Amino acid sequence: SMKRLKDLREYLAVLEAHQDVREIDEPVDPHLEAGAAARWTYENRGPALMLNDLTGTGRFCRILAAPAGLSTIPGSPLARVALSLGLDVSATAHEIVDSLAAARTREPVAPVVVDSAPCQDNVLLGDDANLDRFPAPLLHEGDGGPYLNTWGTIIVSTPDGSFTNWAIARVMKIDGKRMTGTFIPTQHLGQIRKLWDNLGQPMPFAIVQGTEPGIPFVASMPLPDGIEEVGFLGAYFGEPLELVRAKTVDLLVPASAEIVIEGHVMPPEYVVDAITYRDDPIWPISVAGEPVDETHTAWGLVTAAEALALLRAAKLPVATAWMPFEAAAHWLIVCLTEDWRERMPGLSRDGICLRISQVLAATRIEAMMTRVFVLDDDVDPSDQTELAWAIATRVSPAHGRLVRHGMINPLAGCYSAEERRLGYGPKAVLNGLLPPMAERSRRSSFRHTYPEPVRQRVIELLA
Template sequence: MGMKPLKSFREYVEVLEEYNEIVSINQEIDWDLEMSAIIRRAYDLPSPAPLFKNIKDSTPGFEVLGAPVGMSPNREHPFIRVALSLGLPINTPAPELVEAWSHLPDVNPIPPRLVANGECKENKLLNEEIDLTKLPVPFIHVGDGGRYINTYGILIVRAPDGSWVNWSISRVMLDGPRTMAGVIIPSQDLGKIYRQWKEIDKEMPYALCLGVDPGIAMIAGYPLSGDVNEGEIIGGWYGEPIEVVKCETSDLEVPATSEIVIEGTVSLEEMISEGPFGEYAGYTLVGHEKPVPRFNVTAMTHRNNPIMPVSVTGVPSEESSTNWGIAIAASIQNTLRKQGLPIKECFIPLESAVHWLVVTVDRSQQKVGNEQLAHEIGDAVFATRAGSYVPKVIVLDDDINPSNINQVVWALATRHRPDKREIMVDQKVLPLVGYLDEKEKREALTTKAIYNCLLPLNSCSEDKQTIEASFRSYPEKLRNHIIKNWEK
């Protein structure tokens, strides 16, 4: 597979422009809802990604790229932004993107290479020189608790003993000129490392990098298991080390080509109110703010004319589906294959807001009955870290393309017997799943379901068989003849 990794966010923006995936917006746009409403409409149509050049009350020269990995209006290559982000050919179909990305956990890690200087050091601001409110930070959804400075950048933290460096995407709300409110979920890697710093009673240094290689943003959404260093895994994916530079006020290392780097420490005592925020399930729970640790800022470095990415989460599809959903499906596909289950493909339909996982079965490899197989698949999925995020698994024959929502809905409606649904109680879940009640959110446990839509194995006698009544059931020669002469 022709890998062509894009080694900076700037290069990604340039390549998107080449493929007509960007529209520059030169008129003044308000950061208060207007910018995000434009981004939301870009997802919904879909349209090219809006690149805002002139944002009200913001430092001139600072730009914003909305919908960085939204779906493309390009009918032939709807997943072009995902493919480019992963360094894969633009015509790679969705299931093949998942297939390629499913091999990520098996790469040979290549540690980052520390360099003396990088583009992110073109401008340096320390302490009082910093005013985050002058950045083009959007007020995103109606009902949000504040302006969100991070929706698609990466947070870098390191365990106190230096053994584990974590790169992840986690939302961060603006609090003041030099303070931010960061969501730290105890079960996530960021939460585990924060706990280690609390145990030794020291503030945790962090670096927030806005605008990193598209591949780094993709890996930051990948549920890798164990205490692995994303910076080494992405090097393995690229086949060469990624370049990093030292921070100004801590010894953390950040991608050298980052557009903006915000450095500081996370308070152990000071809590500030964060949220609510429109979530990937598609809802803003107004009135649901909660106390989170205060992120104090000590330095900010940035490229000349930096470009900030903004993802506007909510009703699908946005980066939650195209980045995280594809990564979850890839991670689960890797696990199911390793466990020897006869699966063909895994996919999280974009429209399902990461609440459905579709698994197709290679019937030629099937050794057990349908019900047992569906149970084994569900069991294996829910036992994984990636599977903890997904509450519903739909198991289908491989005549269905799991990335084609029309086929998935048709198969679910016509092949699933309601009495063949299997319920599994007390399963681990991310507290952001749409329908959880307060108790389930607190305990991070819920009921999950497996929808067995497998057709009966060899149930029909030779003279009574089922044929799909559709265009694709006609002889191939006839189909090709009709397609060729369609215009006539």
């Protein structure tokens, strides 16, 4: 019973109904103010912002800030993530990652090609296809230039057209016709780009902004090599995604897009050949930084879902997995089921942490995990206070730490200059599992230390 939102207009109408989006009619400068407005919103847990009037381009193209920031909906901080993934506004952290991990066990659903889409109501070709017609947000003071892609999806196919990857990567503006961005060889955009370099031809590309809200989550997900995001999205929502043919390149793009930037990557510069957009386009942005923004609510969250699916595929009894937002997507929490010993009869607590480390180390996501804490599932790892309490009271100050050295996340902060320069540094797995213990010996709180009738009576008096 999914509640898939089919485009950004539907997503915004649902946020509006829950008073979780605010319109700003005063002029906002894309030079630093739009980015600062997004940071204020994340950090104060404000409503998403629709910047209706931007210096330089006026009311032509709106900007959506904090598209999946923490929500203002009372009692539902994950509501933007939940709604983006077609779940109830009050879906829990565990229901979200479990829904994504469950879809990894299902067969991919091929998309369907539609003849027309609102994203092509307006078409700009040749010299008219110029990025100077749209906002060029300078998101942070020290950035190298305007970051045109922070929440949109890059689409590239292999030369034969048999495989297509969808990915969010940062793209910076050079001028009105050119953009640039990194093509890491360990990522899929780079692997596909190498195939176009071997044939000696420019790689065709498309960048879509403001699609249905589920796409940027799956485009952030580190799926295995050879698994298409569009197929996974189809299996996740239980129906085909509708794609439309691009106007100047042989690529299929989401029909739900607000804006489509088409072109070729020269053998790294993106060259714009066409820009298509629906009437009154909206360009979402994501302003990465300290917690909590979409680096944490989308990228780290879908990385936790992928870890949960990989650990379960290795038959480990993992109740849930989560990348705590306060740890800025540097940490993975792995919670084992209460009966993990019955499910894995031959291993001690140290043994199951060794096995988790071994399984995670064989996957694509291992370098992202600066720390993995292994805990019992009486802890909700999305509850900041309960998670800090469990780590402080269950992880020894000296033992239960399994260090590995190898490839590291170059964006992670906890590395020395030498470790960064070598791309070689430590990653740890910390054992916070308890021995078999009665609920009242490991807890001391309202819900764990008082009989049901006493709690009921207190709830009647106070709630």
